[PDB]
Amino acid sequence: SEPSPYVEFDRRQWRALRMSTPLALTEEELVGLRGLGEQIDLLEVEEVYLPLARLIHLQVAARQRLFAATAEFLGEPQQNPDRPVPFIIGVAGSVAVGKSTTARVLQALLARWDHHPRVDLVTTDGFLYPNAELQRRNLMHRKGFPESYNRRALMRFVTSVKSGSDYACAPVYSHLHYDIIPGAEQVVRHPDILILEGLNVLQTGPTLMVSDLFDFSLYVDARIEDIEQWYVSRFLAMRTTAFADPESHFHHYAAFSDSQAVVAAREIWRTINRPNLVENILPTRPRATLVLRKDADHSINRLRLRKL
Amino acid sequence: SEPSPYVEFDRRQWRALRMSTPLALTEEELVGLRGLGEQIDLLEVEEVYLPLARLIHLQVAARQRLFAATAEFLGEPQQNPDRPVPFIIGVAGSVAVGKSTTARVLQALLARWDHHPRVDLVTTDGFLYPNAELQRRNLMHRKGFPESYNRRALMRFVTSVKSGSDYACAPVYSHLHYDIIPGAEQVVRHPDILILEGLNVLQTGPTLMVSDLFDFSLYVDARIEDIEQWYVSRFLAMRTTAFADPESHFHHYAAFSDSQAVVAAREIWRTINRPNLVENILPTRPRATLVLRKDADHSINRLRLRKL
Numbered sequence A, B: 001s002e003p004s005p006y007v008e009f010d011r012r013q014w015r016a017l018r019m020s021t022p023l024a025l026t027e028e029e030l031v032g033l034r035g036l037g038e039q040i041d042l043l044e045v046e047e048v049y050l051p052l053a054r055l056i057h058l059q060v061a062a063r064q065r066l067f068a069a070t071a072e073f074l075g076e077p078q079q080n081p082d083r084p085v086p087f088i089i090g091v092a093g094s095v096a097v098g099k100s101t102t103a104r105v106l107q108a109l110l111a112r113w114d115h116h117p118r119v120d121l122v123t124t125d126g127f128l129y130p131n132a133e134l135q136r137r138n139l140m141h142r143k144g145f146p147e148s149y150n151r152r153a154l155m156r157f158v159t160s161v162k163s164g165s166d167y168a169c170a171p172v173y174s175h176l177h178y179d180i181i182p183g184a185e186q187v188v189r190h191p192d193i194l195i196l197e198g199l200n201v202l203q204t205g206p207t208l209m210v211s212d213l214f215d216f217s218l219y220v221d222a223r224i225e226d227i228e229q230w231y232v233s234r235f236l237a238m239r240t241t242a243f244a245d246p247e248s249h250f251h252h253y254a255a256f257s258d259s260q261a262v263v264a265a266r267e268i269w270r271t272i273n274r275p276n277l278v279e280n281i282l283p284t285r286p287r288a289t290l291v292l293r294k295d296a297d298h299s300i301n302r303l304r305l306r307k308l
Ligand SMILES: CC(C)(COP(=O)(O)OP(=O)(O)OC[C@H]1O[C@@H](n2cnc3c(N)ncnc32)[C@H](O)[C@@H]1OP(=O)(O)O)[C@@H](O)C(=O)NCCC(=O)NCCSSCCO
Pocket: A034, A035, A036, A037, A094, A095, A096, A097, A098, A100, A101, A125, A143, A144, A175, A176, A178, A198, A199, A234, A235, A242, A243, A250, A268, A272, A273
């Protein structure tokens, strides 16, 4: 007898909402989107992602009719090929939670629909300030925090795209170089669906922000303590991986021993990622349209949907 | 070349968006909804309100199709007479801004449509805690502030109605008695549109709140300084009005002289209403779907719409 804005699901029940939804993705292509540590198999794609894709594609149609209503109020025509208001999806979660993978997968699944939609993916890491300006603000120790990103630029970019611009541009970020790529840019030209993935993308504030432009939002959740381990394991793993390359802004880590590294990583987590996570990311979870709850083994076996 | 989520209007331009919208309200009925101080004439109803009503009725249809999409995802039928998800409208603004009037008018205009919708109006003042419990919380001096209302109850009520409940109930408040009416209740039975009007109705928080359930939101704005005068004038005016009645929890004011009162009122404003206004209400203005900007003469001659 107690109504709720949320609907809780166990994967076993959620998996049934897939219905006819075809699986237009392969085992190959899947590993080509898989992220370091993420153990996502086709089964999870069919049981978790496909239902989500169906939910989203049902929403896109209706949400665009809603904007069209306002356009009709403004005496504004739907000139040219009815260029519907792009549908914006936000994907957030902690560092090392798996959100990068989630978004790449969602883009693929969402893209492979019979009416062939234009689906773009944009990570907000490209809106982080170059390291230079990052120190001119004494924020190199807070990289990842809301402040470390150019929120006005990010808001403009998304506002321009949802506004109907023929095109808009974003910077590009280099994870190896740990910094923005000079002159490098990412162009987005009037997509049917735009997905924005990043740490604080769901953050709120005194002024309208990108979170206020999302038509749907995804939050990748995990036991805080479980993510710490994922982060470390990935740290160590990366020693013999990305770091190795001398061009790694962190090559000085490759030489670390299991112990040393784990010690270094754990500290970084305690001083930067955990705080940002707790102070800025978690707080947004309640308003996310859909929460993907992962177990210590990376498997998403539980979800929380906002039906209201 | 700079896109915006907002569209600014002068009444002179906004008034044209009325189109064919019939004026189903009379000069009589209008004063029967007018509030103490509010100088709203039929002309403003036709130039300001009617366009708003048209905007809202265009939105209702589409917004309900959007929820129906989710319902379809959940394998949930639209059984019985497709009882569409009620459309919730929030109306906020400072004390003495005119929001009470605005909402009564909107209800009337919105109700008089050819398809005859069920439009309910609920002031959140009925969710204020009885004065008793108000002191058990040391909050009689903060009456009006978020804390003074039972936000869990309010959230339940609205969540129940938008949930599709055959009916839900709210307490009733007595402005003369300055307190909740014992055993008194207000029943709402599955409306097509529910309007919630009050001070902090747009407030946000760590948890989902009623603001998160609004399908549209109205903010009644005025120069902070201008509202102070409206408040006082209404104070003095009320001396020879509501107060007069000895049952007035404030009869002790009727005997005040122009000076005295103005002095009393101004202080109350400075210690209670202005702070709440500045600390809790104003902050919500940026996210309101539509802002009604009033001049010192109560005339709404400017507006800001959120098209995004
Ligand atoms: C920029 C930030 C916040 C990462 O932000 P994101 O939104 O990209 O989140 P996240 O780090 O989880 O995702 C990064 C993606 O890009 C990869 N990546 C992350 N950091 C690095 C890196 N340093 N070098 C190469 N690749 C990296 C990572 O593997 C992810 O790709 P996959 O989806 O294929 O697995 C993080 O790299 C950072 O610098 N944080 C400051 C605190 C901190 O963690 N300092 C230690 C830096 S060395 S440990 C590298 C892994 O965290």
